[PDB]
Scaffold this active site. Sequence first.
Site, PDB file in Angstrom:
ATOM      1  N   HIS A  78      75.542  14.796 -46.533  1.00 33.74           N
ATOM      2  CA  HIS A  78      76.142  13.465 -46.579  1.00 33.74           C
ATOM      3  C   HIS A  78      76.432  12.920 -45.185  1.00 33.74           C
ATOM      4  O   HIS A  78      76.690  11.714 -45.043  1.00 33.74           O
ATOM      5  CB  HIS A  78      77.391  13.490 -47.484  1.00 33.74           C
ATOM      6  CG  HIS A  78      78.637  14.035 -46.850  1.00 33.74           C
ATOM      7  ND1 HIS A  78      79.110  15.309 -47.096  1.00 33.74           N
ATOM      8  CD2 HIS A  78      79.553  13.446 -46.049  1.00 33.74           C
ATOM      9  CE1 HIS A  78      80.238  15.493 -46.435  1.00 33.74           C
ATOM     10  NE2 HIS A  78      80.537  14.373 -45.804  1.00 33.74           N
ATOM     11  N   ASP A 106      74.867  19.825 -50.686  1.00 33.27           N
ATOM     12  CA  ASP A 106      75.329  19.012 -49.563  1.00 33.27           C
ATOM     13  C   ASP A 106      75.126  19.735 -48.234  1.00 33.27           C
ATOM     14  O   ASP A 106      75.998  19.706 -47.362  1.00 33.27           O
ATOM     15  CB  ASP A 106      76.796  18.625 -49.728  1.00 33.27           C
ATOM     16  CG  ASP A 106      77.194  17.484 -48.828  1.00 33.27           C
ATOM     17  OD1 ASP A 106      76.287  16.806 -48.290  1.00 33.27           O
ATOM     18  OD2 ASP A 106      78.414  17.247 -48.678  1.00 33.27           O
ATOM     19  N   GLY A 129      85.928  13.442 -40.743  1.00 28.52           N
ATOM     20  CA  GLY A 129      85.074  13.759 -39.622  1.00 28.52           C
ATOM     21  C   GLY A 129      84.931  15.233 -39.328  1.00 28.52           C
ATOM     22  O   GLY A 129      84.283  15.586 -38.339  1.00 28.52           O
ATOM     23  N   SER A 159      83.768  17.478 -41.799  1.00 27.96           N
ATOM     24  CA  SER A 159      82.735  18.088 -42.622  1.00 27.96           C
ATOM     25  C   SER A 159      81.693  18.727 -41.717  1.00 27.96           C
ATOM     26  O   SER A 159      81.368  18.204 -40.650  1.00 27.96           O
ATOM     27  CB  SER A 159      82.067  17.076 -43.551  1.00 27.96           C
ATOM     28  OG  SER A 159      81.234  16.165 -42.865  1.00 27.96           O
TER      29      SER A 159
HETATM   30  C1  LIG Z   1      74.413  11.605 -50.037  1.00 27.25           C
HETATM   31  O1  LIG Z   1      74.047  12.870 -50.550  1.00 27.25           O
HETATM   32  C2  LIG Z   1      75.118  13.694 -50.915  1.00 27.25           C
HETATM   33  C3  LIG Z   1      74.856  15.078 -51.521  1.00 27.25           C
HETATM   34  C4  LIG Z   1      76.016  15.986 -51.922  1.00 27.25           C
HETATM   35  C5  LIG Z   1      77.470  15.500 -51.713  1.00 27.25           C
HETATM   36  N1  LIG Z   1      78.589  16.375 -52.106  1.00 27.25           N
HETATM   37  C6  LIG Z   1      79.949  15.896 -51.903  1.00 27.25           C
HETATM   38  C7  LIG Z   1      81.140  16.776 -52.292  1.00 27.25           C
HETATM   39  C8  LIG Z   1      80.179  14.496 -51.296  1.00 27.25           C
HETATM   40  O2  LIG Z   1      81.481  14.022 -51.090  1.00 27.25           O
HETATM   41  C9  LIG Z   1      81.521  12.809 -50.208  1.00 27.25           C
HETATM   42  C10 LIG Z   1      81.515  13.094 -48.974  1.00 27.25           C
HETATM   43  C11 LIG Z   1      82.873  14.005 -48.861  1.00 27.25           C
HETATM   44  C12 LIG Z   1      83.666  13.968 -47.540  1.00 27.25           C
HETATM   45  O3  LIG Z   1      84.211  12.965 -47.196  1.00 27.25           O
HETATM   46  N2  LIG Z   1      83.753  15.201 -46.743  1.00 27.25           N
HETATM   47  C13 LIG Z   1      84.658  15.199 -45.610  1.00 27.25           C
HETATM   48  C14 LIG Z   1      84.307  14.536 -44.271  1.00 27.25           C
HETATM   49  O4  LIG Z   1      84.950  14.688 -43.265  1.00 27.25           O
HETATM   50  N3  LIG Z   1      83.123  13.715 -44.256  1.00 27.25           N
HETATM   51  S1  LIG Z   1      82.809  12.998 -42.766  1.00 27.25           S
HETATM   52  O5  LIG Z   1      83.908  12.112 -42.369  1.00 27.25           O
HETATM   53  O6  LIG Z   1      82.683  13.949 -41.660  1.00 27.25           O
HETATM   54  C15 LIG Z   1      81.355  11.939 -43.068  1.00 27.25           C
HETATM   55  C16 LIG Z   1      81.449  10.900 -44.221  1.00 27.25           C
HETATM   56  C17 LIG Z   1      80.565  11.543 -41.820  1.00 27.25           C
HETATM   57  C18 LIG Z   1      79.985  12.570 -42.805  1.00 27.25           C
HETATM   58  C19 LIG Z   1      85.501  16.454 -45.373  1.00 27.25           C
HETATM   59  C20 LIG Z   1      86.149  15.140 -45.819  1.00 27.25           C
HETATM   60  C21 LIG Z   1      87.410  14.791 -45.027  1.00 27.25           C
HETATM   61  C22 LIG Z   1      88.305  13.914 -45.533  1.00 27.25           C
HETATM   62  C23 LIG Z   1      88.158  13.247 -46.935  1.00 27.25           C
HETATM   63  C24 LIG Z   1      88.092  11.701 -46.813  1.00 27.25           C
HETATM   64  C25 LIG Z   1      88.094  11.048 -48.228  1.00 27.25           C
HETATM   65  C26 LIG Z   1      86.835  11.483 -49.022  1.00 27.25           C
HETATM   66  C27 LIG Z   1      87.261  12.484 -50.135  1.00 27.25           C
HETATM   67  C28 LIG Z   1      86.046  13.048 -50.859  1.00 27.25           C
HETATM   68  N4  LIG Z   1      86.549  13.934 -51.875  1.00 27.25           N
HETATM   69  C29 LIG Z   1      86.124  13.765 -53.280  1.00 27.25           C
HETATM   70  O7  LIG Z   1      85.365  12.896 -53.572  1.00 27.25           O
HETATM   71  C30 LIG Z   1      86.717  14.719 -54.323  1.00 27.25           C
HETATM   72  N5  LIG Z   1      87.281  13.892 -55.368  1.00 27.25           N
HETATM   73  C31 LIG Z   1      88.670  13.422 -55.249  1.00 27.25           C
HETATM   74  C32 LIG Z   1      89.280  12.530 -56.354  1.00 27.25           C
HETATM   75  O8  LIG Z   1      89.327  13.726 -54.308  1.00 27.25           O
HETATM   76  C33 LIG Z   1      85.673  15.690 -54.905  1.00 27.25           C
HETATM   77  C34 LIG Z   1      84.970  16.457 -53.755  1.00 27.25           C
HETATM   78  C35 LIG Z   1      84.624  14.904 -55.741  1.00 27.25           C
HETATM   79  C36 LIG Z   1      86.413  16.711 -55.816  1.00 27.25           C
HETATM   80  C37 LIG Z   1      85.174  13.826 -49.855  1.00 27.25           C
HETATM   81  O9  LIG Z   1      85.646  14.701 -49.214  1.00 27.25           O
HETATM   82  N6  LIG Z   1      83.744  13.462 -49.696  1.00 27.25           N
HETATM   83  C38 LIG Z   1      82.998  12.324 -50.452  1.00 27.25           C
HETATM   84  N7  LIG Z   1      79.080  13.634 -50.920  1.00 27.25           N
HETATM   85  C39 LIG Z   1      77.719  14.134 -51.130  1.00 27.25           C
HETATM   86  C40 LIG Z   1      76.558  13.211 -50.719  1.00 27.25           C
END
Ligand SMILES: COc1ccc2nc(C)c(O[C@@H]3C[C@H]4C(=O)N[C@]5(C(=O)NS(=O)(=O)C6(C)CC6)C[C@H]5/C=C\CCCCC[C@H](NC(=O)[C@@H](NC(C)=O)C(C)(C)C)C(=O)N4C3)nc2c1
Length: 198
Positions: free
Chosen positions: A76, A100, A156, A158
């Site tokens: 992602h 992911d 940021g 992940s």
């Molecule tokens: C496009 O192809 C794909 C394939 C697989 C995939 N698999 C996934 C599980 C997935 O998740 C999406 C991305 C992931 C994410 O933001 N990760 C980081 C991060 O830092 N990113 S990042 O900033 O570096 C970036 C954006 C530059 C890169 C660690 C989190 C830090 C803070 C959280 C901020 C708020 C978002 C909360 C989300 N949390 C939920 O949605 C849960 N639900 C609730 C209600 O909470 C769950 C996880 C559903 C239970 C969440 O964490 N997300 C959404 N996207 C994908 C896409």
Amino acid sequence: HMASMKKKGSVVIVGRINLSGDTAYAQQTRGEEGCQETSQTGRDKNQVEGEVQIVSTATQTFLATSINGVLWTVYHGAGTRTIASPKGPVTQMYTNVDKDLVGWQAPQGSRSLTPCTCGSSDLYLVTRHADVIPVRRRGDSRGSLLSPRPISYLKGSSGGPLLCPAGHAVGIFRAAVSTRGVAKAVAFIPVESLETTM
Ligand SMILES: COc1ccc2nc(C)c(O[C@@H]3C[C@H]4C(=O)N[C@]5(C(=O)NS(=O)(=O)C6(C)CC6)C[C@H]5/C=C\CCCCC[C@H](NC(=O)[C@@H](NC(C)=O)C(C)(C)C)C(=O)N4C3)nc2c1
Ligand SMILES: [Zn+2]
């Protein structure tokens, strides 16, 4: 139209999380303009060091972690993008949207974490701000923060590592579990899942 179809840039290493000593700290190695230019050419001549890189595209910044000679990050964040390197863009050697997960060959000069076989549930999450956050493992792909934090603090990060007490790689941080904006738990890609992909 075909003649003007654009190409997506490469992922670019723009810094690292320094874990070499007693104090963890973020280091920037490339600024925004050099990042933009390096993303377009795919040619990054900077020296790479360490296990956890800070990486960026034109629109996102996140982390990437070297384990077993592969630099791993989240789909992602990176999509199917190449990564910049001294001799040009490098194509992913692993891609799995279902996990992911993506991976490139580890850059020359990087150091790799060793996969954990301790079976321990007392973990540590490393963020892009060099915070080391205690996390209790709660399942195959979940852990709880001992001290919950607003999701703003994890955004940021992940692609960063969860580590065991001995500093082995236990997983790759994937997503935060958020209740009213507070991260009480995280989801990660287990290192066993990386090892199967390899
Ligand atoms: C496009 O192809 C794909 C394939 C697989 C995939 N698999 C996934 C599980 C997935 O998740 C999406 C991305 C992931 C994410 O933001 N990760 C980081 C991060 O830092 N990113 S990042 O900033 O570096 C970036 C954006 C530059 C890169 C660690 C989190 C830090 C803070 C959280 C901020 C708020 C978002 C909360 C989300 N949390 C939920 O949605 C849960 N639900 C609730 C209600 O909470 C769950 C996880 C559903 C239970 C969440 O964490 N997300 C959404 N996207 C994908 C896409
Ligand atoms: Zn271990």
